[PDB]
Design a protein around this ligand. Structure first.
Ligand SMILES: [Zn+2]
Length: 389
């Protein structure tokens, strides 16, 4: 695959200047972080962090209103913009605050799903690269996590954003969610988590006998993709070097039976069908006479289910890349992802700052390929607006 790295980043300053002057959607961005103006000082107490040239960054930047933010962004033309928590005081006054009183109080619940966490189950790309094959992992992650957040937790205001390179972020923005404690956020991650363990750990998925609906519904999403993704594109049972990795996920007592059936068959599709049958006949507990799909599902989960960094989601003060910021090393915009078109999302066609600046002079983002992504954002804002009395 490819890491999408910009070959010549010396173009970035003049492109950023144009982007921040004419294309960055300031009015919509402020409408987001002002949250209807119904909490006093909510925008003014938000931390922003700007990264400049040479990875030099400034923390605890804050702004009075939309005009202020516009002017500072156009003055500093940052390479990166990170959004942090809403604080007890204006961040840009935190040094006037007596020690201990400056506290992060609220922030969106965020997830950060990164392709490198799947390195142990990708056959297509080296660690730093992505390709059209492994991007399906992100498609599944979005569907699995968005459905749970929406249906199981009742979170209504969920913004999925491209990372600009190798992953996706989710911003959960409900007012009740912004107030949740670190402990509660950790509990949400634990509910959503099924793949656990480092490279130290060979088998990373262990299912209980009793199936919770979250596991069933997640498996059912994976099943829509698994044949094309895992058996065709990844070809996970192509040969012994690869199918041995799967046998390491199932009891040793069925390896020989599976080894021999893998050698008699000719493709990953056939070999998966044998695995499902042998697995469904394994007696997990010599006591009872109960059989089922747990091994099959554990394999599918280990290969297809997202890995969730609990630190990202539990920290109230965590800085995360801003929607509509520019990835300095790829040029790609951190665009919102239309959930209704998740299967059509291609990171390789996400607008770059170079591309949309060329479109601009050939007035407004509506003249450019950024426009449909602003409309996705606007729908998210409309749903937030509808929720307020
Ligand atoms: Zn790949």
């Amino acid at each position: 695959g490819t890491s999408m790295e910009t070959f010549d980043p010396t173009e970035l300053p003049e492109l950023l200047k144009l982007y921040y002057r004419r294309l960055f959607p300031y009015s919509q961005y402020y409408r987001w972080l002002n949250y209807g103006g119904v909490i006093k000082n909510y925008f003014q107490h938000r931390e922003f962090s700007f990264t400049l040239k040479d990875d030099i960054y400034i923390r605890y930047q804050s702004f009075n209103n939309q005009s202020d933010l516009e002017k500072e962004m156009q003055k500093m033309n940052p390479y990166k913009i990170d959004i942090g928590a809403v604080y007890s005081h204006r961040p840009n006054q935190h040094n006037t605050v007596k020690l201990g009183a400056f506290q992060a109080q609220e922030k969106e619940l965020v997830f950060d799903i990164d392709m490198t966490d799947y390195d142990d189950v990708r056959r297509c790309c080296s660690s730093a690269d992505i390709c059209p094959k492994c991007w399906t992992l992100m498609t599944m992650a979005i569907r699995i996590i968005d459905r749970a957040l929406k249906e199981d937790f009742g979170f209504k205001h969920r913004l999925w954003v491209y990372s600009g390179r190798r992953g996706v972020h989710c911003w959960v923005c409900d007012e009740s969610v912004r107030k949740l404690s670190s402990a509660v956020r950790s509990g949400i991650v634990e509910y959503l988590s099924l793949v656990k363990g480092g490279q130290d750990v060979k088998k990373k998925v262990h299912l209980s006998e009793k199936i919770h609906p979250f596991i069933r519904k997640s498996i059912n999403i994976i099943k829509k993709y698994f044949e094309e993704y895992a058996l065709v594109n990844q070809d996970i049972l192509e040969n012994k070097e690869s199918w041995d990795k799967i046998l390491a996920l199932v009891p040793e007592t069925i390896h020989d039976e599976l080894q021999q059936s893998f050698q008699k068959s000719h493709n990953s599709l056939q070999r998966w069908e044998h695995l499902k049958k042998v697995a469904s006949r394994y007696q997990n507990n010599i006591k009872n006479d109960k059989y089922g799909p747990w091994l099959e599902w554990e394999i599918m989960l280990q290969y297809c289910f997202p890995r969730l960094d609990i630190n990202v989601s539990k920290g109230i003060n965590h800085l995360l890349k801003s929607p509509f910021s520019v990835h300095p090393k790829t040029g790609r915009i951190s665009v919102p992802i239309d959930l209704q078109k998740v299967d059509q999302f291609d990171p390789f066609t996400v607008p770059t700052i170079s591309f949309i600046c060329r479109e601009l002079d050939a007035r407004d983002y509506k003249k450019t390929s950024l426009a449909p992504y602003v409309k996705v954002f606007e729908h998210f804002l409309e749903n937030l607006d509808k929720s307020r009395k």
